[PDB]
Amino acid sequence: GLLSRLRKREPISIYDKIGGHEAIEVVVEDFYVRVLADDQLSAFFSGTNMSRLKGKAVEFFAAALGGPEPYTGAPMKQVHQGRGITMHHFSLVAGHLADALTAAGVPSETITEILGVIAPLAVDVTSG
Amino acid sequence: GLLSRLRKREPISIYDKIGGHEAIEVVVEDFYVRVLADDQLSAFFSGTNMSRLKGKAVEFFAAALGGPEPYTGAPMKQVHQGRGITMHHFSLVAGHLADALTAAGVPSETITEILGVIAPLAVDVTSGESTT
Ligand code: HEM
Ligand code: HEM
Numbered sequence: 001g002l003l004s005r006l007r008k009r010e011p012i013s014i015y016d017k018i019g020g021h022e023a024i025e026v027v028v029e030d031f032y033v034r035v036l037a038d039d040q041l042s043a044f045f046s047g048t049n050m051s052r053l054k055g056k057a058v059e060f061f062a063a064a065l066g067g068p069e070p071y072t073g074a075p076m077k078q079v080h081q082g083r084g085i086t087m088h089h090f091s092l093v094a095g096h097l098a099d100a101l102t103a104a105g106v107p108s109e110t111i112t113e114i115l116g117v118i119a120p121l122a123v124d125v126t127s128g
Numbered sequence: 129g130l131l132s133r134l135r136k137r138e139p140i141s142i143y144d145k146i147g148g149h150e151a152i153e154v155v156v157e158d159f160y161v162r163v164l165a166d167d168q169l170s171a172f173f174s175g176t177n178m179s180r181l182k183g184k185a186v187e188f189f190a191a192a193l194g195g196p197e198p199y200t201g202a203p204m205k206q207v208h209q210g211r212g213i214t215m216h217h218f219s220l221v222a223g224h225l226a227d228a229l230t231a232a233g234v235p236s237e238t239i240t241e242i243l244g245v246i247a248p249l250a251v252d253v254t255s256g257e258s259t260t
């Protein structure tokens with residue numbers, strides 16, 4: 001865990017900072033509540049197995065933020081391309097992610113840091 | 129609690145000044161009495177689960193006034209969008225919030241300070257500029 005990683009002089013990741021796997025689960029869960037409640041976004045997920053998605057998103061965010069656990073889903077570009085997702089939709093989704101982090105008690109500067117990791121992904125996600 | 133916050137050298141907030149979570153509870157309950165009695169406002173809440181709304185409103189006001197717990201509800205812009213809420217409606221709601229704070233015995237100056245936090249929310253909440 002973090003303790004073993006610190007003994008190896010490995011740096012503290014965002015994942016570690018925000019509370020690891022348990023914190024990612026809480027944040028992802030709240031994230032999808034918000035997204036599916038947003039009448040601009042919910043229809044994109046009409047054909048989606050939400051239980052599977054949330055599992056993959058937990059894995060995605062953990063790995064993306066420096067956690068030791070693997071992401072086991074499909075590439076971002078392949079998944080999202082063709083879905084008619086615009087920069088407008090991406091921004092709403094990013095907004096919900098920030099709200100989830102805020103709701104979880106993550107300091108705002110760390111949320112900004114997470115946005116800096118996620119924002120460049122708009123290339124693989126969007127089409128507009 | 130405030131006792132721990134002060135030992136950690138965290139500052140006293142507006143939340144603390146008005147009596148914390150317990151005070152916000154009471155103000156929020158009275159706030160919605162006032163709102164639902166206002167013929168100009170009540171229809172907006174037809175079919176609203178008031179118990180749930182009040183819980184979210186307590187969270188919102190506590191956090192906006194510098195309290196220790198995050199707001200966990202939906203953001204102001206999003207939740208009020210598509211309802212055609214005007215600057216007149218918003219003014220009415222703000223008045224009702226101030227009257228509830230008045231009724232709770234919050235000093236005039238502290239109510240004005242709270243209104244300073246709340247008035248900027250008009251851009252998120254309203255869709256229409258009419259004051260009638
Ligand atoms: C903000 C950055 C985003 C990240 C990190 C992200 C991440 C993911 C992940 C990990 C998956 C699962 C991939 C798999 O099935 O293997 C996924 C699928 C999906 N994403 Fe995103 N996504 C993002 C933005 C968006 C946006 C903006 C939309 C549309 C508003 C969207 C819509 C979808 C949909 C509908 C699926 C499931 C497709 C299916 O039913 O299998 N995503 N995304
Ligand atoms: C003082 C500014 C205001 C604040 C701080 C505020 C706060 C809130 C909060 C915390 C929620 C719940 C969000 C959630 O469900 O997560 C909400 C929703 C709502 N607000 Fe406001 N609001 C304000 C102004 C107004 C005005 C002016 C109106 C219209 C007269 C209004 C009508 C509503 C309605 C109809 C809902 C949805 C309730 C439902 O869930 O059915 N609000 N607001």
Ligand SMILES: [C-]#N
Nearest residue numbers: 035053057093
């Ligand atoms: C993808 N959410």
Ligand SMILES: [C-]#N
Nearest residue numbers: 163181185221
């Ligand atoms: C709005 N309450």
Ligand code: NA
Nearest residue numbers: 078079080081
């Ligand atoms: Na695709």
